[PDB]
């Protein structure tokens, strides 16, 4: 019969179908495992690739972020210092306004001959008492020379009493006039040899006073810091 078997033609068909089903199923399982492992490897490798770069990103991100909070802190510090600086500057300007207004008042008295005349006379004599020479050179403003030349007798008479051990011969009104923007009032008295000079102007007295009165005022309104 050219067909060696113990099964019916349908049984051998069932068996063949069974075997090819085995093969097909094996292939399907193999494929399933392939794809599963492929998914797992996908996840692992993606994670690794990302991590390898984030390790470098976070590295410089940390450095940049560290230098930002520092910048904020420095900003806060600079502001905090700026405010204190504004306080100290406020104190200084406060002490400035007083001497400025004082200078203004001196400039006011300077342009008031009714009160300026006895004051001007009082300053000229004091300078003479500190000079103590028979002759003296007086250097004043161009506007004051008229007032001074009208009261020379008064000056010489006043000086000849407070210093009887040192008479006064001649008072010389200099041709060199004081500066308009430097001197508001007063005189500058020099000697014949022009070695000793006595600046008895309002500005000079105010400055010399400010050299010693300013810290006194400062340490009276407030306290030493």
């Amino acid at each position: 019969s050219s067909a060696i078997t113990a099964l019916t033609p349908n049984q051998v068909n069932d068996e063949l179908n069974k075997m090819q089903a085995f093969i097909r199923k094996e292939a399907e399982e193999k494929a399933k495992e392939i794809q599963l492992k492929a998914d797992q490897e996908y996840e692992i490798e993606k994670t690794n690739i990302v991590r390898n770069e984030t390790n470098n990103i976070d590295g410089n991100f940390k450095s940049k972020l560290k230098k930002a909070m520092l910048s904020q802190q420095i900003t806060k510090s600079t502001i905090a210092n700026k405010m204190r600086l504004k306080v100290l500057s406020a104190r200084e300007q406060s002490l400035d306004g007083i001497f400025e207004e004082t200078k203004e008042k001196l400039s006011g008295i300077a342009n008031n001959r009714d009160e300026y005349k006895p004051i001007l006379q009082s300053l000229i004599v004091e300078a003479l008492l500190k000079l103590l020479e028979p002759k003296a050179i007086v250097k004043a403003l161009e506007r004051d020379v008229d007032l001074i030349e009208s009261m020379k007798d008064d000056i010489m008479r006043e000086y000849g009493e407070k210093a009887q051990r040192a008479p006064l011969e001649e008072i010389v009104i200099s041709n060199d006039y004081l500066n308009k923007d430097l001197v508001s009032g007063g005189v500058v008295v020099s000697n014949a040899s022009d070695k000793i000079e006595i600046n008895n102007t309002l500005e000079e007295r105010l400055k010399l006073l400010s050299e010693e009165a300013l810290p006194a005022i400062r340490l009276e309104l407030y306290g030493p810091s």
């Binding site: 067909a3 060696i4 078997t5 113990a6 099964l7 068996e15 075997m19 085995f22 093969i23």
Partner: protein, 106 residues
């Protein structure tokens, strides 16, 4: 000259070499699952082989047996089956007094 007078160059089918008996058509070449085993069966057990070889092991190809050779004492069959069941098949065949001929082709 077709009528050739031959002589006994070998022994019986159970122990003789098979290089001058078999041919490429008898074997299943290039298969991940399938392979071919040769079985020498004593003549008194021919019918016994024919009705039991399909269950000697699992994954034996049904109705795949064919008489390859025959002498005075033996009949040489070939059977196709899955490679992973060759061991079980040969063991079972040896248990039933059959002589599995080892033949590794390529």
């Amino acid at each position: 000259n077709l009528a050739a007078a031959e002589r006994k160059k070998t022994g019986d089918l159970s122990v003789r070499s098979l290089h001058d008996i078999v041919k490429p058509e008898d074997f299943v070449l290039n298969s991940e699952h399938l392979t071919t085993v040769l079985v020498a069966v004593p003549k008194s057990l021919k019918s016994d082989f024919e009705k039991s070889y399909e269950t000697l092991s699992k994954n034996v190809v049904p109705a795949s047996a064919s008489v390859i050779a025959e002498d005075a004492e033996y009949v040489l069959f070939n059977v196709h089956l899955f490679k992973k069941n060759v061991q079980e098949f040969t063991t079972a065949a040896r248990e039933k007094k059959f002589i599995p001929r080892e033949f590794n082709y390529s």
